[PDB]
Amino acid sequence: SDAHVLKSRLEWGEPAFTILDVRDRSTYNDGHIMGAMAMPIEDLVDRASSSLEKSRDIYVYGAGDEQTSQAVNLLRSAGFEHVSELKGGLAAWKAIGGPTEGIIVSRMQNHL
């Protein structure tokens, strides 16, 4: 799906969707899409299935098209019904003016 759509969802849309950053944790921390949850791909299914309803609208993005498509396949094979890639990932999001948040403590995050 297109970055312009997700940006609209975040500015004006119904609350019911989640953005999943599927890259490395530290990478997420250095910078991620505003609102995205850190679900590194190594434990994506386990983590998503224990935290997200299968009917929830989910947008996924990783470091590149390959990682993103892999994350998307995983979640669906796990029973998730509304998952889509975020074409262009982070880069495409910045290009259209989308905000990026960064963290500056792994125990707070895991315990979380």
**Sequence ranges of the binding site:** 30, 42, 101
Torsion of CA 88, 91, 95, 98, to 10 degrees: 100
Distance CA 60, CA 40 (A): 11
| Residue 104 binds a copy of itself (CB under 8 A) | yes
Taking CB within 5 to 8 Å according to partner kind, which of a copy of itself, Mn ion, none is near residue 10?
a copy of itself
**DSSP type of residue 53:** -
| Residue 108 binds a copy of itself (CB under 8 A) | yes
Q: Which stretch binds Mn ion (CB under 5 A): 3-11, 20-28, 52-60, 70-78?
A: 20-28
| Residue 50 binds a copy of itself (CB under 8 A) | no
Q: Of 88, 96, 89, which is closest to residue 8 (Cα–Cα)?
A: 96
Per-position DSSP letters for 20-45, written without gaps between them: EE-S-HHHHHH-EETT-EE--GGGHH
- Binding residue (CB under 5 A) for Mn ion from 60, 101, 107, 110: 101
* Minimum CB distance to a copy of itself smaller for 77 or for 106: 106
Distance CA 58, CA 16 (A): 9
| Residue 53 binds Mn ion (CB under 5 A) | no
Q: Rule CB under 8 A: which residues touch a copy of itself? A: 7, 10-13, 15, 31, 34-35, 97, 99-105, 107-109, 111-112
